[PDB]
């Protein structure tokens, strides 16, 4: 369920 990296607000 991690598809990439989170950058900035969710």
């Amino acid at each position, epitope marked *: *369920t*991690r*598809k*990439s*990296i989170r*950058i*900035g*607000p969710g």
Partner: antibody, heavy 113, light 113 residues
Framework: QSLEESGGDLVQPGASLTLTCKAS?????????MCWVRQAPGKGLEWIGC????????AAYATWAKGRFTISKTSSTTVTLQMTSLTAADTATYFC??????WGPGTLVIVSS | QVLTQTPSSVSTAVGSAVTINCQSSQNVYSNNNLAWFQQKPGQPPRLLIYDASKLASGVPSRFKGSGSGTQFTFTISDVQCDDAATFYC?????????????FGGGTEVVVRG
């Protein structure tokens, strides 16, 4: 709402070392991507890896780092980074970041004989 | 995943506009997982732009990015001395087809006053 890294030092080649990232004003019970990034003196940003917190728990890494370093949530306000088989190529300042939005000031690592 | 940033450096006057470019070997995640940072010496990087063109909060509008897929640009309008720093782009990728992220190589910006 801040971060601080500790645990940097001078280590011999082939040694091992654990860095800790401490959270203030909030806890890792919520949903974040907690990642480490290192920067050798005078060089560019390099991504090491991430650990998700809250409602999912994926560990992911750069190809170079994969298998040699580990990242984990050791409490609700500590995320660690563990390194092994250290060499000169690993000398750098190490940042931990929350969502690449909030950053710590950095802890430093020299590998040399 | 390799993010190519050009130029490696540029000198530019106060009052000018300045453009930095980022080019990716594969499409970034969802065609827009792409971001821009400023870093002065001894500080950690700072988020300016994410999702290719959203201003992070508290960040002035004279910073502007655009682009899609593999090609992205960053423009600073009305340059001032406070802008002198090194800038990076950050690429976020499909974790299943390769690595999750790659930092661009950095542009050093020098302001002429």
């Amino acid at each position: 709402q801040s971060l601080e890294e500790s645990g940097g030092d001078l280590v011999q080649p082939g040694a091992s070392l654990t860095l800790t990232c401490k959270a203030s004003g909030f806890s890792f019970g919520n949903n974040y991507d907690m990642c480490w990034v290192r920067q050798a003196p005078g060089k560019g940003l390099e991504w090491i890896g991430c650990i998700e917190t809250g409602s999912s728990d994926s560990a992911a890494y750069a190809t170079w780092a994969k298998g040699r370093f580990t990242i984990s949530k050791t409490s609700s306000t500590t995320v660690t980074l563990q390194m092994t088989s250290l060499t000169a190529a690993d000398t750098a300042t190490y940042f931990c970041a929350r969502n690449f939005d909030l950053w710590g000031p950095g802890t430093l690592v020299i590998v040399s004989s | 995943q390799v993010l190519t940033q050009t130029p490696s450096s540029v000198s530019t006057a106060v009052g000018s506009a300045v453009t930095i470019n980022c080019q990716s070997s594969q499409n970034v995640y969802s065609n827009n997982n792409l971001a821009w940072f400023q870093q002065k010496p001894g500080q950690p990087p700072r988020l300016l732009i994410y999702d290719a063109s959203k201003l992070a909060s508290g960040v002035p509008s004279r910073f502007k990015g655009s682009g899609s897929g593999t090609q992205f640009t960053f423009t600073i309008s009305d340059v001032q001395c406070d802008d002198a720093a090194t800038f990076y782009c950050l690429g976020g990728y499909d974790c299943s087809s390769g690595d999750c992220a790659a930092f661009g190589g950095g542009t050093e910006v020098v302001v002429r006053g």
